[PDB]
């Protein structure tokens, strides 16, 4: 089987450069089209360009040129798609697809943001009401300004309504929600918790939720 | 009278028909640059 999948990058500042590493050792070596698939979060699926080992040929496409560079190396067996002199535009997420009759062997893929921005922690603000029999519950988040974050609820043991939530922009900070649903048996007599968590600014935010 | 002549023997079916004539022109390479052009290429036999 093509082992394994593709690697990981994060914001790296302004002026150097970042480097994927797309790792496919399916071998199959060494002639074939490494095409590189990127999609926005507009779902549209574009093309960054392909790359051949046995001579050396690579390619381009004309919103992706100026200089984004396809290097091969046959002795690792992976292939560059990195892309330098950026803009934030180029937060999407990049696929690997190899040759084929179609595009057959894709990759897992990477969605690389890239900015000069600022890590921000996140902020748990209790969202309870001040009557039914079972009442939707949550916490919301507000002004985490990298895209990754953690959702939780009671740590994989009230994990049934838990609804996922985008967090769509507004004035650069990130706004998503998590609501689960609670039975009137439990609530408020088990203490009910959200546990967040920021990967890129390493900071936990805990808070209890008390019935108003 | 006059007689005659000139037998319809290439007026026939198989004269007519039976001439090599080219169908389909295949083609393929060895490095495969786009599609079309790769290697390996097919064709469903139709006349």
């Known amino acids: 089987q093509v082992q394994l999948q593709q690697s990981g990058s994060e914001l790296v500042r302004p002026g150097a450069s970042v480097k994927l590493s797309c790792r496919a050792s399916?071998?199959?070596?060494?002639?074939?089209?490494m095409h590189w698939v990127k999609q926005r979060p507009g779902q549209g699926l574009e093309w960054i360009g392909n790359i051949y080992p046995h001579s050396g040929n690579t390619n381009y496409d004309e919103r992706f040129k100026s200089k984004a560079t396809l290097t091969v190396d046959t002795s690792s067996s992976t292939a560059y798609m990195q892309l330098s002199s950026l803009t934030s535009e180029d937060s999407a997420v990049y696929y690997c697809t190899r040759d084929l009759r179609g595009f057959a062997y894709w990759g897992q893929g990477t969605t690389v943001t890239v900015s000069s921005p600022k890590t921000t922690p996140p902020s748990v603000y209790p969202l309870a009401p001040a009557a039914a029999s079972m009442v939707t519950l949550g916490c919301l988040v507000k002004g985490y300004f990298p895209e990754p974050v953690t959702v939780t609820w009671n740590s994989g043991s009230l994990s049934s309504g838990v609804h996922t939530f985008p967090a769509v922009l507004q004035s650069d900070l990130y706004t998503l929600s998590s609501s689960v649903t609670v039975p009137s048996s439990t609530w408020p007599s088990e203490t009910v918790t959200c546990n967040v968590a920021h990967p890129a600014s390493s900071t936990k935010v805990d808070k209890k939720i008390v019935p108003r | 009278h006059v007689i005659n002549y000139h037998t319809r023997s290439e007026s026939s079916i198989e004269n007519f028909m039976g001439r090599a004539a080219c169908v389909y022109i295949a083609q393929y390479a060895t490095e495969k640059v786009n599609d079309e052009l790769d290697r390996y290429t097919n064709w469903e036999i139709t006349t």
């Open positions: 399916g071998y199959t070596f060494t002639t074939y089209w």
